[PDB]
Amino acid sequence: ARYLGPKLKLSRREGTDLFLKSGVRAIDTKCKIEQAPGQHGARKPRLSDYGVQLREKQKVRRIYGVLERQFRNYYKEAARLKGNTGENLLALLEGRLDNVVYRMGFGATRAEARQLVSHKAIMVNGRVVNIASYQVSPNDVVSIREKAKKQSRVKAALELAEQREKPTWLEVDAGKMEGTFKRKPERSDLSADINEHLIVELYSK
Amino acid sequence: SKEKFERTKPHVNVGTIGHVDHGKTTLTAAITTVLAKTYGGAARAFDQIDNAPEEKARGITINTSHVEYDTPTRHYAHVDCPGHADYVKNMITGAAQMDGAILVVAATDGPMPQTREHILLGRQVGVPYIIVFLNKCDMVDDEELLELVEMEVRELLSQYDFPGDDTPIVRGSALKALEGDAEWEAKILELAGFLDSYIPEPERAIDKPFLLPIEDVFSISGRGTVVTGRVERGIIKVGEEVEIVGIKETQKSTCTGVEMFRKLLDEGRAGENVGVLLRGIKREEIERGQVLAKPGTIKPHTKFESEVYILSKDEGGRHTPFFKGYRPQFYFRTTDVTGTIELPEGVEMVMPGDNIKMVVTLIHPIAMDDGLRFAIREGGRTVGAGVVAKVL
Amino acid sequence: TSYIGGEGHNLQEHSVILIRGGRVKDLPGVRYHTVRGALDCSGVKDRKQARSKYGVKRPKA
Amino acid sequence: NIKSAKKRAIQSEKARKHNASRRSMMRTFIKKVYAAIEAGDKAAAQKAFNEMQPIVDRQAAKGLIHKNKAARHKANLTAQINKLA
Amino acid sequence: MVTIRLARHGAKKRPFYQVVVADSRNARNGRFIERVGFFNPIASEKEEGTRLDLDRIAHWVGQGATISDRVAALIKEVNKAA
RNA sequence: AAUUGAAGAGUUUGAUCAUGGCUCAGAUUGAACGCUGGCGGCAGGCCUAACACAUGCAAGUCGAACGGUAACAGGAAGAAGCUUGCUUCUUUGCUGACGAGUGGCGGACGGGUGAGUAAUGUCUGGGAAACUGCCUGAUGGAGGGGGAUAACUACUGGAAACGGUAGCUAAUACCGCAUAACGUCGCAAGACCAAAGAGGGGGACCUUCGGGCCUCUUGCCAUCGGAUGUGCCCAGAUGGGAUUAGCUAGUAGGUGGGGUAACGGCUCACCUAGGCGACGAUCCCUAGCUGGUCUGAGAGGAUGACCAGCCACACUGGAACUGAGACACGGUCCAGACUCCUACGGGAGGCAGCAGUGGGGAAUAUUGCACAAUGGGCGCAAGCCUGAUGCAGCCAUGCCGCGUGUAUGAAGAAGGCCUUCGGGUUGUAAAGUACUUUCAGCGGGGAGGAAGGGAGUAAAGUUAAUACCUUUGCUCAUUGACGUUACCCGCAGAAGAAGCACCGGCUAACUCCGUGCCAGCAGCCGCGGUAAUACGGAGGGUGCAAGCGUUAAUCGGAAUUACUGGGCGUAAAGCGCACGCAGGCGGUUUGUUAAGUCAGAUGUGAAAUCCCCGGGCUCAACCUGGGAACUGCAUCUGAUACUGGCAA
RNA sequence: GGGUCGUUAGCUCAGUUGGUAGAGCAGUUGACUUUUAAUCAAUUGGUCGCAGGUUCGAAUCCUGCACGACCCACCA
């Protein structure tokens, strides 16, 4: 399921970091970023048209950790919907459960918010959900299982989370670990740099 | 399978052995019919035991067989052994089962070539008890001759290392014993007493992991593939999966059903000379001479170092010594696996009739328990007697 | 008439082997390929880099 | 095979025995009329008609003969003697 | 013998019962003259878990269509309109 | 709200642009193989041998149909011990209950497989010359006798299988007689056609003390309809081949007899000499068909595994009986092969039902459990049977989920590696340090799938009756195969869990040494002839993931079978030319008709499945509700421009 | 389980009183060559299936196994 590997090298192959290794050290700087992915990193990235569409997938997929078999169904799930594909695609890519915890502030890193959900710390509408795939519907509330509430892993990540952008399509309380998922996202507020134009076209073939 | 076997008196894994044409097979039939008057349920004649059609026209034992006989005192698992020289691998397989052997030596013939071979192969096969019986005593009438033949028994057993000191020697005639001469028949019954008295029960290691050395494979229509041999250790009932460790790459399957002479068993303990059916395994998918222990407990080793007692011709084996590049057959409880022998760095070659250890390889993997006395022989005669000093 | 895939084999003009479809476009007359490591045709020694092909098992280590 | 429900067989055995005799005698009544028609003894055949009717119709109501089957013999044969009558 | 019975649809450990109007001779899950409403014994608490148009059912029982035990109880659940 | 949808690349040449093949990039599967591997969820699991199959099991039930009891639980007349009711223990079908027998209904279904067959089949829409136990609406009757046999006895055939002779005996078994009609025959008159009785409770009358008798439950028989299912008929659609052109004899039709439930050369007898066929009859080959399935933008191509409908078969060829229904998977008989028994005369037998073996093959499952739920059979019911169904197992075979951890960490280690041996990379990667603990592991609590059935008791109808029976309430007793459940909780500790293919372009990602047209790669072009980015191995990166890849099969891309949607001067391709039958097509004007056409309405287009919109499974897959569709066909009533028939 | 027969340079094969293993094509090394063929020169190659025993000495006769292809039994 998970890559379970060095999640800093993924941002050297891409060059543009996608919040992989937050933890304590805010900015990487310990990787000689942008040009060294291995023994022959000095090679020129000629990158053909196939590559620019493939790395766009490497960009999105490496964000939420969604594997291809699963990720591919999301595309079919996107096109079957009404109208704009990549837009309905990101809507799916935001509803994901372990992603919400990352957004609520309880998880500094994705792997944290992933194992945080995996380690029984979710109570949505009075229901515990161990599975990280749970696409959260709008107008849904959640909190943290009392025995795993305000624990060591959450505090370090939560206090550090007040320095962020703090998204708008949701909001938490963090005084008793009370979260509420608001409306569905819109392309204007989110990412704004990922050209979903490509991936949809890559999945056209 | 028919009508569950009532596990009564303890069975003792025995079997008659001896020289070719000494009347061993007909003696067994004679034993069964006479015991059929102490414990009635028996009538296995000569045709009942020399069942094989190949054996039928000629009158010889070539296949390792089994018959069920018992005295009201104790139960018994019998093995009719092939008395020939070119079929001794069948005899080692036939004697591997044993704990108490019945040496059939003609009181008229003395220590014969195969007799000396069956005693030498009765030695390295691992039999600890040799109850000697003088068959064909009706042909000889002078008792003075018998005094020498009895001393000759003392000769071949003590020849190396055996209990041939208080050997119970009964004088009966197998043919007369089977056909109806009551006097020779009671003499077989003296042996019946010796079969129960001279032989104490063999302690069964049932608390240890299950083990089952493979004798031969059958394919009884209706249930699947049957595998026979003796239960070396522990107990099992239908359900426990087993790892078929043998000369090939290991396989795993669940044992189902255990019978004994068409007599159904729920569970089979250590020592049980029984048959085993498996879960979805072909007749081809199982060979003659493998191991059936519990899953994931044995590594099929080929490398090892082992002390051995090579035999001189005057001792019953090799005429001359051997260099590094000698490859005899090794009998690990059941079958043959030729291992090219190489002696350690101190030896180029060493003489027969001595004790020495060396590292040898095997062309076919097997359990290889480091400390088990294994059998070795080449070209017809017993060339060695060793013990696996260590395993690799 | 198939092809022997890999460096060195131990076939003995007998010993039933398995076959998969594939023509080695270097020999005008071969349309089949043999399944290495399968039932009789043993795999090649010292193999690494994709041992699925060549039917060789992963080293004992 | 040997099933306990083979009782239906031995029953039908016992059934076909009389069922044979019932239809056998039934058609002879009909055979009586064909002997008559070939000659022309209509009155005797008519005496036999109201004679074979109560026996054939009886066969219909029992279960051996289907009502339309027995009525079929009452249909054509009436016209048969009527070809003469 | 045309009747009104269950069908036993669903899955492993998660059954479902398509109440129908099928023939006695045919296989349960198979052929049916026509069908009406459905029943979920494991709905237990939600928007809908028991539906049967008794009017058409009356046309059936009021024609000679027998009822199975549980389906008669399905009617017993409502009695007429309760 | 119900398809908002169509990508190209490599490859002929010194280079180009075509025509044109070949191959790949995608999706799919009842998959197998190689290497590798934690579990859980829902699904599937013999494609070949329709070859043979050992054993268990796969269809019974009713005493409330009849005589009866072979055993047990009781009473009962009784007898033995012996503490005189403490017990023994012979008789009694008097009872609960119930072998076997007889009779009824069932076994014609459920479940399996795809041999056959190119039309008797099937899908589709109509049609008339029919039948339909079980359920039910309405019309009535349900009178009264007779003569046997099974059971069981007595002798007894035969090894067994399996009977025979001679008698006992009832039935809701069978056979008449009475009575028949709205039923049959029939112009009519006339004539004929049926049956069954059991059980609960009980007041007077009644007691040969059998019971008649009264009531209720319920069944039997004849009738007309509904309902449901079956048979039949016609048209249309439904593979390939013309290197098959003729095929047909009861074959085409009439009349008359006969036949079936019913029409019919269905079958016969006589006469007539027709019938099918170039829009393809025959013969040969293949083959289950459709809803749907995989793909495809669509049109179509391929396909029909599971599931659902239908058809056919049940060791091989054939026949017939009973029965409402079969010309019958677990029925009979016949002949045969193939296995078995045997007292050698003669007998037994069909796993293409569920498991399992042999055999075959690339290849596919346990001789597991319960009838708890549902479905069917029988019964008043309780219950009894059910390898249908519902579960568990076994397999990464497929689709969905989570896991093998998270965070910090420069000393920028060791070792491997490239080296300009300056240094860079492997690499926050590792150890370390600080946190958490899914899933197994293991110890505890714990849903729901369960409706009803039973007694008790309560109330209203029915009835002579506060009886019984029927409809409706409450109590207690409980009834779960799965099941050491789903799930919640708790313990300990990163502790048990990442491989697999690629890396020259196609197409994502590159270097080192060894081998030198040798050893090999490979789907396509082509790499290897002493510095290999294509071989081998090393390093690193890359892509997918508990699988990843290979192989076969299908569609696609392939507008390379082009109807949508292609070409014929040289690229494959104008017959050498002409006359010409059917064939296909037709100027201009009007009238008419309305077949094609279009319109709208109706019926049907089974359901499920695809799609849209909800909900329930922790989400998902999945299940399920409603909606839309099924682009079709047929009928009705309309419009009539145009195409066609008819007239001028 | 058993009972017979087969195996020689790399390939195709020789080889019986038991006496130091040969025939080509390969191919190895040169030369001309970009690399080869070709052409002129030279030329190794089995440790006689694997082991053991007999013999003085074994491809040769006898034993045992491995690996096949042909034969009968294998039946809790």
Ligand SMILES: Nc1nc2c(ncn2[C@@H]2O[C@H](COP(=O)(O)OP(=O)(O)CP(=O)(O)O)[C@@H](O)[C@H]2O)c(=O)[nH]1
């Ligand atoms: N005089 C005599 N003849 C006898 C006696 N016993 C046997 N014979 C005969 O000796 C022969 C060998 O019988 P068998 O029992 O096969 O011998 P074996 O010793 O098993 C032989 P193998 O070596 O093949 O296994 C038979 O002919 C038997 O009848 C005996 O006691 N006395």
Ligand SMILES: *C(=O)[C@@H](N)CCCC[NH3+]
């Ligand atoms: C079968 O159950 C065995 N006990 C029979 C004797 C050994 C096999 N021959």
Ligand SMILES: [Mg+2]
């Ligand atoms: Mg013998």
